[PDB]
UniProtKB/Swiss-Prot annotation:
Protein name, entry field: Lysozyme C
Alphabetized GO MF terms: beta-N-acetylglucosaminidase activity; identical protein binding; lysozyme activity
Expression (tissue specificity): In the egg white and polymorphonuclear leukocytes.
Species of the source: Gallus gallus
Primary subcellular site in the record, as a coarse category: secreted
Record gene name: LYZ
Length: 129
């Protein structure tokens, strides 16, 4: 599923992401935009042989099991394939664990480089929430 901006905002709001650990909804939409272009089916391989999965590009090195990242953790306790579903629940539940782990949204390189310190409220402008 490729989400529309407001569609995704509403979905993330329903799943409890607005102001989760102090991050306004705009931050999450901005992150999803640059990580996945709002496509639940996005995958990208890393140089270390890990793979990033889904709308928030969660990394198999730490967070999910894809059966081919030897020595990796499965900290969200999910197959990485679950992160590619049209239903964002698994991605959102995993993201909450990541964002809680001490580094905040700095875990997402595209957030740090493209969202952090910008007007992120722009990303939810116009939406009925
Ligand atoms: Cl916002
Ligand atoms: Cl980047
Ligand atoms: Na959903």
């Amino acid at each position: 599923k490729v989400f529309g901006r407001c569609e995704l905002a509403a979905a993330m709001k329903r799943h409890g992401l607005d102001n989760y650990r102090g991050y306004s909804l705009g931050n999450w939409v901005c992150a999803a935009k640059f990580e996945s272009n709002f496509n639940t089916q996005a995958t990208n391989r890393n140089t270390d042989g890990s793979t990033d999965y889904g709308i928030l590009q969660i990394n198999s090195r730490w967070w999910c099991n894809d059966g081919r990242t030897p020595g990796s953790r499965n900290l969200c306790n999910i197959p990485c394939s679950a992160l590619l579903s049209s239903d964002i629940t698994a991605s959102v539940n995993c993201a909450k664990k990541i964002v809680s782990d001490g580094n905040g949204m700095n875990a997402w390189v595209a957030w740090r480089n493209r969202c952090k310190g910008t007007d992120v409220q722009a990303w939810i402008r116009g939406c009925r929430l």
